[PDB]
């Protein structure tokens, strides 16, 4: 035998082709449950018992438990049947039970004889007699068979039930295979007579007579063993039996799971606990030790008192000596109610309590953490009277009364203790639950001599009103307890508490002598002098105290005498009553009767004033003159009080609140002395290197024949978009200027997008409908390729038309964002055909004209066709609010300025004015004034409008293009107007001067004046494009499409 | 102090207990309280109940020395008396300070300088005590005149009740009357809120309501006034197409007589004579220039643009490109005349204006095959457009 | 990211009361016809009544230290406690769940506290970050703020659209743009009190100090200290402790 | 030996001899206001002792005392002999204070009641229209603001309407323009062009100066404005083929040197051309003659230098170039 260390347990090292006989026994217990050969100059875990130890050992082999590892030694000795495995040399040292009652048959010795001689006892000494006890249970058929292991485990049954004792020795065995012993007064020891003939059958001299451990399983099926075990305990102990719960909060886990089928399943119950307890030693984590505790007190009811104190309690101190607080709080309240769930003495628990459990407590009476001082505060109120109890009980089973005094000075002790603790939460926490009841264990002269004053330390932490509040609502109790030789100490402390500063403090005293009154613990003078100073209070201001000291005052009514009451209480109550009542003692008749408190705001300006005694000194002389003891309301000795009493008059205190102020003054400056000693770029795939427009139309394409209305250049694959009424969306390469037309979607055709990320472009129509189409014009078979490849329609009603559209790419989803005529923008995830985000337009802004979204997607900008603009954040898709314009004339075109960060072009119809607005600062901050109309005059009387913006960063010169009604193509310079020049019309055409005039603070520049290639009609679109050279993209409303290189 | 004829009764007597209590009904604690008889007069006195003991320590509480000790002790508030102590205290043996019991059913007094249990420098001068009786005396009458006093007041009070439990039912009543008066304030405060608050928003509503009809108003007389102009956009449409046709009617009858005017021809062999000269595809200076004049004409006439416009000379008409990058100022002017030293100038001369002629067939509409064709395809373009 | 544990803060819990908002449950008149005594009640004096916050702490069902009062404090305008409550416990007493149950309460007679309101707040929010922050919780009305797990009286659960960006933004999860943020944020409280006006409901606000002798920027997580065998034993070798227990006893 | 002791105090007696002297008058005035069970200094001092537990008895207190027990409580006792004398004038001027309190007449207060009741009940009543007022005005402002909020929808979809509207009405007044600028270009070409004779646009006869160009060409040289013979012949060239085309409008031809399409004889010639065009003319309509006149052989002509009769010319041919368009 070497037991020895390994890295999950001990384990057990033992020494003497014998290597094989391991290997197949092994093989065939693998899956056996309740035995373990060797593993593998040998191994076999470490398992915690014996059989003889666990008989020993202070937890007690209970009968049921016996019959328990009788059941699981049948069943071991089965199991080893049936997997062709037989021992030889069962014993009580070998059937090795586990912590949590798991019984091992240990190291089937195959190499053990089979037969025996029987006048030759060295080969019983050798194997079968390792611990030397001498008591043999070889087979007397041997001097290897399955009835020979039987009887060696009705031997080990029969030592089961007989305490240890012996069964056989080697001559009784001798003597009983000649048939000449038997043993069946050792017999006698066995406890019941189930076991007594479970032990007779198995041991009989004839093996053939002996059943089968199956057999005697079988029949044993309730006489003995019940079916519980059958039923419910032999799989549900097989889980643990397993290597994968190796650790004792899986065990806890499982149990806490299982709790409700074991109860009301299952006494096998004591089984379970051989389990639990085997875990509660070594749980890590918290919420296991709190699982534990749970189980534990949910499992005590249905255990029996021996049980509880010897197999649990031990455990709940083991965790009220453990870290964490929580764990030591419920460990103490576990404690608590197992205990209280007792009511047996066994006899070695004759005096527990004092002598075991009350010294495991104190630590925790004592401990740091404050939640466990609260926990001991709210629980010494049970322990102690678990203590009484207890030790009544025990009388059933020294001294007795030199044990209750004991008793009585460790509870005193610790009652005393924590009354000093530092923490005001623990004294009030004990002043709530215990101070009351321990009372009783201090007796009075005790009490009163250390329990009454160390409450009365409390008074003095004028910091913590908490503390002196918890101290007024115990006192009743001890007050009660002490009786009547504390009343004279404690009169003038109830007279402090009330007239103290914080007023809930006032509340909780007023309850004080409430309670205490209701007891009849206060001297009747003292009854009447607390009651003439709880009159003022009727009046404070307060409604906590005011209330308060109603309760009091009634329940004063209710206690003494109707002639004390009418005698001194009346008299007392004349002041803050408002009629002349007759039940006090019905406090609805006093709240209703109460006068109106003195307002908060006077009465806290009364007590604010420093030398409030001068205060009073002049209200004092007020009151005699409004009496008549002085003739006059003369001004003051000081100034200060007479300035200090005018301003409060200034409140308008009424005479009545005067006298008030006077009534309470008491209080007031004992009040008064208490609170004294307290990657994404504007810069769009064209860069411009077309500094200047030459005004210059190298082409006159008229392949449109309706108005022409929106251009979108793509510079990806270097075409331009162009759409028209005609519902021709024609798509004309760049290099060449129709490289391609499409007039499939139908309709009237004037908005469209290019995407920035990908092969194909999208389109819009009057009908609602948006369309994509895949374009391949640089590749070239003998044609170039249209695509069509969308569908998107809505019903005007609800969804709309396009009113303009614009494709940003803002990572894995592509955005294609639109507007509509009922001017929600949505964003279609053209890479996800979903939409993602319905950007609503408050419809009382107007139909919205144009849109145009930030750069950098932070941001978008709405201007409808009422002139007043809008702005979206997109990051949370929340409208921002947007200054409107001063004409409130249609906007036509908007633009995302590329200096600057918040800066809106909106080209507004009429007098061919372009506002520049900074949505930041909500208003405008530059202006473009082409027409000779007044300058920034709302009259509108230019009919020309501005419907072409191209706004670009060359050179640091926010370069504009502006074209509309006027047929002119205009360019402007926003840093240098003087720049600002027209390029249309023929060589007749007036030249013009651009003015910079400062307006209200905004900015104007100003056009003043000083073939025909230009269009005949509006020019309803601008846009740039450069190969080599920056082309500028314009169409009319005629139908005509022209290039300005 | 163990002398006798030392004062000793139950003022003298706080604390009563009980030890070692046998009981009746088998084993288990009784809940054990106590009460004292007049020693057989009646008990008065009640003890708090020590629940699950038999061994209890009761809390305590008048000149009289003998006196009735009797335990009750029954479970769950059904009570049964197992003592009988008619104790005189003068037949108590003293215990020092600590109750010690040794028999069964034991009761253990407690008084001022211990416990008992059942056993096995100059006075005052006489003056002094006549005063002494004397007050004590005083006390006693002025006390009992006192209770007298009391007891009166309170027959008087029990006399004037017969009333007053009607006034304090007419306290009731008032307090009733307020408590309505303030509710009833209190809800009218409520009345008024809502009352304002909902005037308020029904003189909104009237606004809102009337201002939406006028809404609707303005809408349809707007859709009115639309389609008025909608009627007056077909007529002008329609007056501009017709006063277009009168344009081309006129473009062509002057076209046409300006086309008499520069012949062309055939021959057998399918060439173009040209006031009688042979055309190779691209004097023969003379007619081109006639040409050059041609296409300026034509581009006067249809309001078309040139793409390389013409300054214009009889048969030194020259056209000028402004568009192409590689020619500089000097460069931007080609000849549609041989000139002297630009043979190659020339010819992209004849060239731009063979694409003026292209352009002018492509925005009449005519799709042009070949475009080395000078005059054949704008004496096409006249007979075509 | 910057955060302490719960179990290493050992001070104790400091909680604002900030205010009481919303239209309370004014009782009918019948109420009080029939309870003369709540004519006295702290409701039918319309000015702001004297309230107080009993904020009890409890965690799993379980009560876990006193109720704290407001210090008294008399109102006119409205119930501006703004008035810290020292919590008997301590953040180490505070597990995942514990939640603090602030019962609102007022007065309804002499002695006699009636509830109005009680609000039943996760200390520990979503993820275990404590509530490190201005809150502004629901007022489950005349029941008291029950802890029970589950919490009959939650708290708290537009806003589910608004908050994630709001941290993804403060955060800096997010694109900054100061302008455009700030007249979203003024947008965004716009929506907060149109919520709040929109229930009949009450609303508290409450809020948790944050003062330590450390560089203050910290979020407070719940936290704790944390084939041989064939037969696995929880037990393997230890104390033999019930035998210990008897060993004590003579 | 100790013989008694401080009862209040617990400390022996010395017995003070006055005691030897009492009385049976002294003292008779003194002494008067389960189971189980328990010689003469010698008779005075026995008659004391006898009279000592009597004394604890019959009062409150437990004789013998000591001198400073004695003393203290009767301080003791002087001051509750104060607070009960104090007592007793409480309760009796509480006495006559209620006695002053009349005995109420119990009818005068059954009026009262009956009085209270009737007011109680009728402020019920009252409070009862209040609650009925209060949801009568519940539902006015429930069901007013129902229709507030279907007037909200009604807006929604009036604005969906007016958005569809003036898209269409600013659309449409964008086309009218558009009609009305295309209405004036074709106006203004259409005019020009009538007015305008083919020939006359082909070769713009009009006054520029002291010229009279033709398409803006110089017809005259002068010493003074350097015109070379390129600019003159183009002129002339010009002049030529109007003249060819108003051979090919009229029919007319000098039949040995019809002047056909060209670029001092030549333009002398050309005299006889427009001399036959005079005549042509004058052959032709009647109506109009030219106006500056012209000689054939002299080759002269009379204002009716050599670039001011050429002016004329064009001039004279404008009047017949006009007329030529006019006549067809
Ligand atoms: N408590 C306990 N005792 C053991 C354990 N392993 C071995 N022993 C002791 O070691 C002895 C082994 O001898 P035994 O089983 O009787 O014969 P074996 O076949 O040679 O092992 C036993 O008598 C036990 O007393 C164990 O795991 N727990
Ligand atoms: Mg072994
Ligand atoms: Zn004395």
């Not at chain 1, 004759?350 to 459990?357: K, L, S, T, W």
């Not at chain 2, 002025?142 to 309170?154: D, P, R």
């Not at chain 4, 183009?234 to 002047?259: D, E, I, P, S």
């Amino acid at each position: 035998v070497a037991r020895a260390k390994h890295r999950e347990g001990l384990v057990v090292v033992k020494v003497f082709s014998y290597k094989q006989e391991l290997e197949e026994l092994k093989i065939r217990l693998n899956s056996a449950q309740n035995c373990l050969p060797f593993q593998k100059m040998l191994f076999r875990q470490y398992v915690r018992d014996n059989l003889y130890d666990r008989i020993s050992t202070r937890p007690f082999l209970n009968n049921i438990e016996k019959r328990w590892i009788a059941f699981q030694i049948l069943t071991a000795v089965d199991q080893a049947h049936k997997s062709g495995v037989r021992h030889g040399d069962i014993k009580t040292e070998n059937v090795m039970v586990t912590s949590w009652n798991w019984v091992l048959l240990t190291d089937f010795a195959s190499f053990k004889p089979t037969y025996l001689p029987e006048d030759n006892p060295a080969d019983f000494n050798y194997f079968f007699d390792t611990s030397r006890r001498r008591t043999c249970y070889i087979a007397p058929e041997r001097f290897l068979k399955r009835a020979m292991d039987i009887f060696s485990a009705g031997c080990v049954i029969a030592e089961l039930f007989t305490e240890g004792v012996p069964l056989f020795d080697l001559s009784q065995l001798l003597a009983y295979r000649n048939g000449h012993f038997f043993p069946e007064q050792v017999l006698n020891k066995i406890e019941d007579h189930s076991i007594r003939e479970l032990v007779t059958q198995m041991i009989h001299r004839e093996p053939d007579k002996r059943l089968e451990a199956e057999d005697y399983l079988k029949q044993q099926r309730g006489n003995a063993f019940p079916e519980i075990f059958y039923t419910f305990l032999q799989p549900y102990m097989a889980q643990f039996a397993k290597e994968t719960f190796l650790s004792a909060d899986e065990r806890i886990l499982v149990i806490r799971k299982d709790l409700g089928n074991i109860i009301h399943n299952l006494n096998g119950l004591v089984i379970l606990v051989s389990v639990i307890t085997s875990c509660l030693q070594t749980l890590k984590y918290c919420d296991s030790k709190l699982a534990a505790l749970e189980l534990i007190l949910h499992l005590a009811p249905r255990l029996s008192v021996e049980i509880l104190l010897d197999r649990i309690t031990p455990y709940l101190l083991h965790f009220s000596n453990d870290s964490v607080p929580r764990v030591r709080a419920e460990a103490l309240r576990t404690l608590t109610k197992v205990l209280a769930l007792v009511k047996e003495v066994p006899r070695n628990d004759i005096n527990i309590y004092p002598e075991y459990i009350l010294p495991g407590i104190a630590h925790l009476a004592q401990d740091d953490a404050t939640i466990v001082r609260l926990a001991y505060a709210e629980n010494i109120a049970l322990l102690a009277e678990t203590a009484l109890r207890f030790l009544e009980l025990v009388q059933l089973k020294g001294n007795y009364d030199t044990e209750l005094q004991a008793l009585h000075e460790m509870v005193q002790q610790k009652v005393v203790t924590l009354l000093s603790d530092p923490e005001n939460i623990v004294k009030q926490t004990l002043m709530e639950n215990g101070i009351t009841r321990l009372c009783v264990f201090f007796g009075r002269q005790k009490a009163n001599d250390v329990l009454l004053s160390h409450m009365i330390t409390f008074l003095n932490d004028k910091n913590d009103w908490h503390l002196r509040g918890a101290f007024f609502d115990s006192i009743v109790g001890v007050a009660a307890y002490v009786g009547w030789q504390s009343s004279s100490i404690l009169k003038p402390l109830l007279q402090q508490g009330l007239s103290d500063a914080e007023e809930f403090v006032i509340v909780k005293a007023l309850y004080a002598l409430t309670c205490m009154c209701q007891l009849g613990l206060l001297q009747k003078p003292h009854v009447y002098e607390f009651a003439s100073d709880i009159a003022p209070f009727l009046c404070h201001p307060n409604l906590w105290i005011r209330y308060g000291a109603v309760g009091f005052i009634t329940v004063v009514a209710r206690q003494i005498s109707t002639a004390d009451v009418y005698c001194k209480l009346m008299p007392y109550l004349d002041p803050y009553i408002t009629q002349p009542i007759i039940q006090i003692e019905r406090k609805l008749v006093l709240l209703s009767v109460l006068k109106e408190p003195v307002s908060r705001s006077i009465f806290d300006y009364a007590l604010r004033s420093k030398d409030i005694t001068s205060l009073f000194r002049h209200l004092h002389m007020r009151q005699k003159k409004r009496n008549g003891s002085l003739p006059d309301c003369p001004p003051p000795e000081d100034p200060a009080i007479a300035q200090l009493l005018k301003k409060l008059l200034s409140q308008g205190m009424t005479e009545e609140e005067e006298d008030k102020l006077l009534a309470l003054k008491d209080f007031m400056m004992k009040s008064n002395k208490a609170k004294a000693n307290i990657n994404a770029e504007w810069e769009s795939k064209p860069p411009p290197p077309g500094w200047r427009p030459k005004g210059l139309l190298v082409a006159h394409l008229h392949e449109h024949k309706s108005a022409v209305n929106r251009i979108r250049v793509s510079d990806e694959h270097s075409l331009f978009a162009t759409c028209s009424n005609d519902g021709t969306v024609k798509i004309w390469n760049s290099q060449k200027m129709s490289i391609l037309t499409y007039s499939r979607i139908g309709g009237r055709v004037k908005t469209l997008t290019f995407c920035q990320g990908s092969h194909y472009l999208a389109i819009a129509s009057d009908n609602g409908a948006v369309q994509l189409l895949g374009i391949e014009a640089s590749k070239l078979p003998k044609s170039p390729k249209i695509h069509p490849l969308q569908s998107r329609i809505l019903d005007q009603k609800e969804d709309g038309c396009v009113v303009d559209m614009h494709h940003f790419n803002s990572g894995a989803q592509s955005v294609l964002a639109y507007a509509t005529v009922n001017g929600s923008l949505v964003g279609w995830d053209l890479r996800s055909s979903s939409n993602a985000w319905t950007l609503k337009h408050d419809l009382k802004s107007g139909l919205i004209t144009s849109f145009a979204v930030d750069i950098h997607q932070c941001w978008l900008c709405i201007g409808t066709s009422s002139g007043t603009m809008a702005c979206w954040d997109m990051r949370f898709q929340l409208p921002i609010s947007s200054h409107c314009h001063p004409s409130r004339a249609r906007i036509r075109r908007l633009s995302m300025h590329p200096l600057y960060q918040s800066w809106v072009i909106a080209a507004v119809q009429g007098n061919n004015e372009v506002s520049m607005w900074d949505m930041e600062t909500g208003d405008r901050r530059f202006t473009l004034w082409a027409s000779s109309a007044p300058p920034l005059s709302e009259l509108q009387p230019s009919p020309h409008s501005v419907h072409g913006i191209y706004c670009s960063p060359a050179d640091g010169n926010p370069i504009l293009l502006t074209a509309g009604s006027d047929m002119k193509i205009r360019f402007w310079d926003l840093a240098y107007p003087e720049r600002s020049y027209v390029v249309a019309g023929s060589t007749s055409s007036p030249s013009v001067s651009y003015y910079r005039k400062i307006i209200e603070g905004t900015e104007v520049v100003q056009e003043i004046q000083n073939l025909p290639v230009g269009h005949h009609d509006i020019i309803t679109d601008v846009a740039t494009f450069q190969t080599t050279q920056g082309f500028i993209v314009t169409a009319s409303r005629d139908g005509i499409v022209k290039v300005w290189k | 102090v163990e002398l006798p004829s030392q004062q000793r009764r139950l003022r003298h007597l706080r604390n009563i207990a009980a030890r070692n209590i046998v009981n009746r009904n088998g084993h288990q604690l009784l809940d054990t309280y106590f009460t004292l008889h007049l020693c057989i007069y009646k008990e008065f006195y009640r003890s708090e109940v020590i629940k699950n003991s038999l061994n209890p320590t009761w809390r305590s509480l008048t000149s009289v020395s003998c006196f009735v000790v009797k335990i009750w002790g029954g479970k769950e508030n059904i009570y049964q008396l197992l003592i009988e102590w008619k104790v005189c205290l003068d037949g108590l043996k003293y215990l020092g300070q600590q109750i010690h019991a040794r028999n069964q059913n034991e009761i253990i007094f407690g008084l001022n300088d211990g416990y008992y249990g059942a056993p096995f420098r100059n006075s005052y001068d006489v003056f002094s005590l006549l005063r002494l009786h004397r007050a004590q005396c005083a006390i006693k009458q002025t006390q009992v005149t006192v209770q007298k006093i009391g007891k009166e007041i309170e027959e008087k009070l029990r006399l004037t009740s017969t009333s007053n439990e009607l006034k304090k039912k007419s306290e009731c009543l008032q307090l009733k009357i307020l408590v309505l008066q303030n509710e009833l304030e209190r809800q009218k405060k409520a009345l008024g809120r809502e009352v304002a608050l909902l005037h308020k928003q029904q003189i909104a509503l009237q606004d809102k309501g009337s201002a939406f009809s006028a809404e609707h108003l303005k809408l349809q007389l707007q859709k009115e006034s639309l389609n008025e102009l909608r009627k007056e956009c077909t007529a002008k449409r329609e007056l501009f197409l017709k006063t277009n046709a009168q344009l081309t009617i006129r473009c062509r009858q002057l076209l046409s007589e300006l086309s008499y005017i520069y012949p062309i021809d055939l021959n057998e062999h399918k060439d173009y004579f040209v006031c009688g000269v042979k055309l190779p595809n691209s004097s023969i200076a003379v007619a081109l220039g006639y040409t050059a004049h041609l296409v300026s004409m034509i581009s006067f006439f249809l309001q078309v643009p040139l793409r390389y416009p013409i300054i214009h000379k009889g048969s030194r008409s020259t056209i000028k490109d402004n568009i192409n990058d590689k020619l500089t100022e000097k460069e931007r002017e080609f000849p549609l005349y041989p000139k002297g030293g630009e043979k190659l100038q020339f010819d992209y001369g004849v060239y731009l204006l063979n694409k003026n002629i292209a352009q002018l067939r492509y925005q009449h509409g005519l799709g042009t095959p070949d475009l080395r064709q000078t005059l054949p395809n704008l004496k096409n373009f006249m007979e075509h457009g | 990211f910057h955060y302490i544990y719960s179990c290493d803060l050992d001070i104790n819990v400091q909680l604002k009361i900030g205010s009481l908002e919303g239209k309370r449950e004014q009782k009918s008149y019948k109420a009080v016809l029939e309870d003369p005594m709540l004519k006295f009640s702290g409701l039918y004096q319309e000015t702001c009544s004297d309230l107080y916050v009993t904020c009890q702490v409890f965690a799993e069902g379980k009560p876990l230290a006193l109720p704290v009062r407001t210090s008294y404090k008399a109102f006119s305008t409205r119930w501006n406690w703004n008035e810290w409550l020292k919590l008997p416990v301590k953040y180490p007493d505070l597990p995942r769940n514990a939640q603090v149950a602030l019962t609102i309460w007022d007065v309804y007679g002499p002695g006699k506290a009636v509830p109005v309101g009680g609000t039943t707040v996760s200390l520990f929010g979503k993820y275990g970050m404590f509530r490190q922050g201005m809150h502004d919780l629901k007022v489950w009305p005349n029941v008291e703020a029950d802890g029970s797990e589950p919490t009959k009286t939650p708290g708290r659960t537009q806003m589910s659209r608004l908050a994630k960006l709001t941290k993804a933004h403060r955060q800096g999860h997010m694109v900054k743009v100061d302008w455009l943020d700030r007249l979203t944020f003024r947008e965004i409280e716009m929506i907060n009190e149109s919520e709040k006006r929109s229930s009949n409901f009450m609303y508290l606000m409450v809020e948790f100090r944050c003062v330590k002798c450390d560089d203050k920027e910290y979020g407070i997580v719940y936290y704790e200290k944390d084939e041989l065998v064939k037969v696995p034993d929880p037990q393997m070798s230890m104390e033999n402790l019930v035998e210990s227990k008897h060993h004590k006893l003579a | 030996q100790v013989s008694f002791v401080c009862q209040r105090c617990s400390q022996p007696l010395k017995l003070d001899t006055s005691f030897k002297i009492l009385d049976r008058v002294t003292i008779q005035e003194l002494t008067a206001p389960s189971r189980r069970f328990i010689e003469n200094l010698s008779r005075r001092l026995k008659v004391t002792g006898d009279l000592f537990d009597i004394m604890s008895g019959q009062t409150d207190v437990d004789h013998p005392l000591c001198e400073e027990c004695t003393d203290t409580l009767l301080d003791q006792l002087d001051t509750q002999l104060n607070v009960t004398e104090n007592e007793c004038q409480n309760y009796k001027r509480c006495l006559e204070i209620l006695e002053q309190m009349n005995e109420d007449d119990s009818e005068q207060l059954q009026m009262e009641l009956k009085e209270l009741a009737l007011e109680e009940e009728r402020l019920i009543q009252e409070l009862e229209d209040v609650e009925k007022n209060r949801k009568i005005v519940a539902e006015n402002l429930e069901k007013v603001q129902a229709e507030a909020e279907r007037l909200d929808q009604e807006e929604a979809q009036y604005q969906r309407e007016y958005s569809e509207f003036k898209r269409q009405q600013l659309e449409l007044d964008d086309e009218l323009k558009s009609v009305e600028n295309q209405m004036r270009y074709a106006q203004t070409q259409l005019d020009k062009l009538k007015k305008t004779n083919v020939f006359n646009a082909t070769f713009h006869i009009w006054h520029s100066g002291q010229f009279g160009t033709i398409n803006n060409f110089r017809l005259g040289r002068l010493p003074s404005v350097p015109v070379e013979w390129n600019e003159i012949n183009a002129a002339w060239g010009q002049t030529v083929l109007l003249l060819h085309a108003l051979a090919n409008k009229m029919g007319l031809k000098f039949q040995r040197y019809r002047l056909v399409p060209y670029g001092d004889h030549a333009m002398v010639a050309f005299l006889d051309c427009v001399q036959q065009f005079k005549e042509e003319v004058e052959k032709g309509e009647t109506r109009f003659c030219l106006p500056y006149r012209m000689d054939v052989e002299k080759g002269k002509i009379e204002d009716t230098q050599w670039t001011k009769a050429l002016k004329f010319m064009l001039t004279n041919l404008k009047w017949g170039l006009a007329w030529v368009s006019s006549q067809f």
